[PDB]
């Protein structure tokens, strides 16, 4: 994906126009750049199989890969290498950075990509072949499950609808909280950016069922959690 990044293509222009002069005779510059561009353009190419993980990463991972690449490219131009030794180390550096990119992509795939265990998460990916940015949808069943909540009369009732991946999901709008009556109809009792609902001084009338619905701009609901609330007598 690093060919997609302006910093990389700016750096490669400077590499060719300014720094190669210091390391190589002019009449090998253009073919050396063909080697460099070829290597760089292959980052994240998939060859079917089990390396589809290579094909897209999020913007943070691209950024890490870009800066890793820039550091190693500068190391090369700052070096005292010339001639064949320079070319050899340049190619090895590009192969090494490709491995680093692959390790970053594998880490992204394992820990960061679609970490939700329920609900629908949206993530922003850069696709490495043609540099397209796209919203990726991680779709699982919307209902995340049911909380059993007990609260003593006259204490505060708090319903929490925050999941760990909500902060990273894209396009979220509001959390709606509903009271779900015994005839199964429901009443909207809060709606806004707050991932929780507070009801002060609960009484027996607050006992029953509630539901949170987290919505998105255009990808449908992202989370539902249900709450079964018992109001206990005072201690
Ligand atoms: C929102 C709705 O459908 N309401 C009706 C009404 O009989 C009452 O408000 C509710 C619970 O009291 O049960 C049903
Ligand atoms: C607790 C609750 O929602 N009670 C409702 C009331 O608000 C509504 O005006 C009426 C209309 O049928 O039904 C009952
Ligand atoms: C069971 C229904 O929903 C709840 C209450 O507000 C009323 O008792 C109604 O009869
Ligand atoms: Ca960012
Ligand atoms: Ca030689
Ligand atoms: Cl869990």
From Swiss-Prot:
It comes from the Eukaryota. Changing residue 133 to A: Decreases adhesion to oocytes. This is Izumo sperm-egg fusion protein 1. Residues 146-230 form the Ig-like C2-type domain. It is a single-pass type I membrane protein. N-glycosylated. Glycosylation is not essential for fusion and for proper protein trafficking in sperm. Belongs to the Izumo family. The gene is Izumo1. Disulfide bonds join 1-128, 4-131, 114-138, 118-144, 161-212. The chain holds residues 22 to 256 of 397 of the full protein. It comes from Mus musculus (Mouse). Monomer, homodimer; disulfide-linked and homooligomer; depending on the context. Interacts with IZUMO1R/JUNO. IZUMO1 and IZUMO1R/JUNO form a complex with 1:1 stoichiometry. In gamete recognition, IZUMO1R/JUNO first binds to monomeric IZUMO1. The weak, but specific interaction with IZUMO1R/JUNO induces IZUMO1 homodimerization. The process follows a tight binding phase where IZUMO1 bends the entire structure towards the sperm membrane side through a thiol-disulfide exchange reaction. The molecule no longer binds to IZUMO1R/JUNO and instead binds to a putative second oocyte receptor. Keywords: Cell membrane, Cytoplasmic vesicle, Disulfide bond, Fertilization, Glycoprotein, Immunoglobulin domain, Membrane, Phosphoprotein, Signal, Transmembrane, Transmembrane helix. Disruption phenotype: Mice are healthy but the males are sterile. They produce morphologically normal sperm that can bind to and penetrate the zona pellucida but that are incapable of fusing with eggs. Spermatozoa show impaired adhesion to the oolemma. The extracellular domain assumes a distinct boomerang shape when not bound to IZUMO1R/JUNO. Interaction with IZUMO1R/JUNO triggers a conformation change, so that the IZUMO1 extracellular domain assumes an upright conformation. The cytoplasmic C-terminus region is not essential for fertilization. It is however required for protein stability. It is found in: Cell membrane; Cytoplasmic vesicle, Secretory vesicle, Acrosome membrane. Glycans are attached at residue 183. GO terms for molecular function: protein binding involved in heterotypic cell-cell adhesion; protein homodimerization activity; receptor ligand activity; signaling receptor binding. Changing residue 67 to A: No effect on localization to cell membrane or interaction with IZUMO1R but loss of its ability to mediate cell-cell fusion. Residues 1-235 are extracellular. Sperm-specific (at protein level). Detectable on sperm surface only after the acrosome reaction. Expressed in spermatozoa, more abundantly expressed in the head than the tail (at protein level). Residues 127-139 are annotated as: Important for interaction with IZUMO1R. One of its GO terms (cellular component) is acrosomal membrane.
């Amino acid at each position: 994906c690093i060919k997609c990044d302006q910093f990389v293509t700016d750096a490669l222009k400077t590499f060719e126009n300014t720094y190669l002069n210091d390391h190589l005779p002019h009449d090998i510059h253009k073919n050396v750049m063909r080697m460099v561009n070829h290597e760089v353009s292959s980052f994240g190419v998939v060859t079917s199989a089990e390396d589809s993980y290579l094909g897209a990463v999020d913007e943070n991972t691209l950024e890490q890969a870009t800066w890793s690449f820039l550091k190693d490219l500068k190391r090369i131009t700052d070096s005292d290498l010339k001639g064949e030794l320079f070319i050899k180390e340049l190619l090895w550096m590009l192969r090494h950075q490709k491995d680093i990119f692959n390790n970053l992509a594998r880490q992204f795939q394992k820990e960061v990509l679609c970490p939700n265990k329920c609900g629908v998460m949206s993530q922003t990916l850069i696709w490495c072949l043609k540099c397209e940015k796209q919203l990726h949808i991680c779709r699982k069943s919307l209902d995340c499950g049911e909380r059993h909540i007990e609260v003593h009369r006259s204490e505060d009732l708090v319903l929490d609808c925050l999941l760990s991946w909500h902060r990273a999901s894209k396009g979220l709008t509001d959390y709606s909280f509903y009271r779900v009556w015994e005839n199964s109809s429901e009443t909207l009792i809060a709606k806004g950016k707050e991932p929780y609902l507070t009801k002060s001084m609960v009484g027996p009338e607050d006992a029953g069922n509630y539901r949170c619905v987290l919505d998105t701009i255009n990808q449908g609901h992202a989370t539902v959690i249900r709450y079964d609330v018992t109001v206990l007598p005072p201690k």
